[PDB]
Amino acid sequence: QIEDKIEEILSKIYHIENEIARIKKLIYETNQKVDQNTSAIADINTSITNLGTDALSWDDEEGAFSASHGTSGTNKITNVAAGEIASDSTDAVNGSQLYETNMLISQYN
Amino acid sequence: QIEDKIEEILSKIYHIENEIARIKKLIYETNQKVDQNTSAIADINTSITNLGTDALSWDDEEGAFSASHGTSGTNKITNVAAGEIASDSTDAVNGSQLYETNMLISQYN
């Protein structure tokens, strides 16, 4: 009876040991995925910070989009293609267009 | 005394088996959270990619905001409300405003 009980005990111990081995694998696999995600989050935080710094964004107090950037309150917007010149146009106009207008005036004068 | 000892060992083995059952559940639960975050991060990466592509942003080669996009280095900005026309105005002006100016000149000529 006691040798049987010892065999029972040892069988139970082997099973526990096997389960523990698998658990160590599972915790490792998990911690690899978590480390991956922690790194990814760090990179995302940088990207979000940069987008926030660099996007031309709405200014609630001004009730308009603002071309302020960092420590510079006013800045150019460039690479703006020519806007439609019409009574209903809501396109921004660029310096080539104002140049043309100024030339019409100087020619007029 | 050895029957007592055997029963105490079997008791502790039962306890350990219970711990292992709990541990397995915890690991599964933890992995469900990690899975959710891994998939949330993939979604975030796409969002950030698209925001970077679509937000009018600062350009460190221009020292200005740049309307480059896709295969065109210049693009229009539209749905721009009329800017204040005043000596100290920093508002963008639209094609309707330039149209009016051009019309004043034209009528004179």
Next chain:
Amino acid sequence: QIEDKIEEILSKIYHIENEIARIKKLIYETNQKVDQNTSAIADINTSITNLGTDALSWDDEEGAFSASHGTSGTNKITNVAAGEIASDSTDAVNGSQLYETNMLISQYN
């Protein structure tokens, strides 16, 4: 022999107990990281939502950046520095520049 067997069994159970305590600690530590990451992803989703609402963004149907915002189909862009007035300038122009042009015309008249 059997008293000896029992001693060896107890020694192994002691080792198992140490492994279980370590595993618990590792799972705790993993979950502290996962919690930190879940929160960080929550913050990121808020930043992304806000950047989307507030960035001046590309509009596929317009093929242009759009100063639409919220319920308002058109809005101002302000804090725009004066653009180059030249035949190949792609700088946006501001209200102070159009004011100046408008005063040339009113002078010429």
